[PDB]
Design a protein around this ligand. Sequence first.
Ligand code: 7IL
Ligand code: 7IL
Lengths: 305, 305
Amino acid sequence: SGFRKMAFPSGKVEGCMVQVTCGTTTLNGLWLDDVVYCPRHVICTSEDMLNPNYEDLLIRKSNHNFLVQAGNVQLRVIGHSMQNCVLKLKVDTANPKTPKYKFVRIQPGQTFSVLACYNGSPSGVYQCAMRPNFTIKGSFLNGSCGSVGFNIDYDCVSFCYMHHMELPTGVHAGTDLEGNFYGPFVDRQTAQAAGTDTTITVNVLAWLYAAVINGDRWFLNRFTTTLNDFNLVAMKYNYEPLTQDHVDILGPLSAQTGIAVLDMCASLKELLQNGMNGRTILGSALLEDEFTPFDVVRQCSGVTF
Amino acid sequence: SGFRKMAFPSGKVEGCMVQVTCGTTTLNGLWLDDVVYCPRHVICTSEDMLNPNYEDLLIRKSNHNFLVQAGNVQLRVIGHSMQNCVLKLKVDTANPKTPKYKFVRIQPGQTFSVLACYNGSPSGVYQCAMRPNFTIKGSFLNGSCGSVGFNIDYDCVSFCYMHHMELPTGVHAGTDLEGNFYGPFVDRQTAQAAGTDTTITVNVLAWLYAAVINGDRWFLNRFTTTLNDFNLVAMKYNYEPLTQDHVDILGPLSAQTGIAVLDMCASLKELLQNGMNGRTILGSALLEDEFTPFDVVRQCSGVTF
Ligand SMILES: CC(C)(C)NC(=O)[C@@H](c1cccnc1)N(C(=O)c1cnc[nH]1)c1ccc(C(C)(C)C)cc1
Ligand SMILES: CC(C)(C)NC(=O)[C@@H](c1cccnc1)N(C(=O)c1cnc[nH]1)c1ccc(C(C)(C)C)cc1
């Protein structure tokens, strides 16, 4: 019993983290086989941050301008190139601790574990979600750039996020591992507005199912609703519309609890319209939207890696 | 910016988890050097769960009655002994991934990371706290027994908790690595209820300081208070008393923000007497008490391991 914000074990990713220094700038790199991946803004200076010409900057750099360190070992950079907003440093040594991995670009509403690193050394691990506006509400200090987000399937690490920068409201922006930013953000110091955010409806329903599995049932009513009538209420409260795919995705949790998805929608419909009256659900006084249906099934069925 | 439930990197602990099998019972063990540690109730049967004679059960066992498995590697048992409520299996092979470690018995209010395991394989990592009533509010399913809690100092792993059993209200009870239970709980099927819990006051104050660091300052008022006038209010709301040591421990956070501790106590007093009025602090509508002052400093200053 119990329900916690649970991350994947971080061991496979720890052995890939290195430190990348260019000039006076230090951040983190991902060492996989003989390539180190890091944010290309490492080559930027204070005189360039407003609108850097990364092509011109990279041309000026040589291999010896990149200091890559893996613990005590300094890795020689033998080549450097740029793929979108990610710098790829070819090094002379393949990482012997390279796990099975793949690069994945995730969808809004999906979650992943972050290994927060500073100076190439891991600091902590936590779980977060790709918001509908393509930001992430992470915990990142100066120099956290190059920390990665990931999921673990079978025995294969799916890398889905590299951290680049903080946004005015304190949220964070980054890329996939091919260097394509999530959302409209760019790697320069400029006025960047994140779009209006919405609540991930299918994740709230999954978290409500997690509550029922753990005995928290007070919010259940005897009503049901149609998918169209629910979305008229979800619209008013800035909730993502619910699709039939979302309903089918909640199939496993509905079968485990014996509560039809449209029944749970009617309970959530009443929660949005009436509030929670100062009561709690799974030790929270707000509706949580950063657990996917798969997350709840993983934690309430106990899969291992 | 940002503030998350952040666990330590789990790689050092992952390389210590093994599977222990006695008869038809399987749970997790901790492999350090040539010794495997696991809960002693693995030698218990269904007809013994009400009141088992562990002395009788151990003396009749032989080394070949224990199956220890580290992934695919079968560890041959060359000795077995019992210390309090933990079984110690001496194996022929020392764990080549044994990290710098020590065994530590934590105090109520201190936090630790939990690596949840099933069949000797890690499933996920999360952050927990030792409640004042000596339970932990974890996420543990059947067979999670033997999963450990830990803290990491530089490169030394301080093991502080081993999971044993679940209590009626869905909270969890366990031991330190010497086999001594936290609280008055015993490893048998009997009527044992956790005592009424209280809130960790020094942790709430540190969490308020984390909020001020992240720009959440609406709860700061013009009042101050004395240590005694605050403790009179904290006792009324089932909060743990605030000691002078707690004030000194909050020294770094008070100096970072420039807010005196007694000033923050006056803000917390108003929050307890008037509620939060539906407002949030760091994304939560309740007062969080599972961040120690050290946890706040670690996340807001960025120490690594
Ligand atoms: C853009 C603002 C808000 C001023 N700062 C950040 O985002 C900041 C930071 C702070 C906290 C968390 N994440 C990142 N960040 C760094 O800490 C950093 C860059 N290199 C090493 N460290 C950063 C990232 C990118 C840049 C550009 C060169 C692209 C403009 C500059 C600084
Ligand atoms: C005591 C109750 C509440 C009925 N069950 C648990 O606590 C339960 C469990 C369930 C969920 C989380 N943690 C533990 N638990 C096990 O899943 C287990 C034991 N060995 C392998 N698995 C367990 C622990 C201890 C015992 C005895 C000491 C009585 C023998 C029996 C079962």
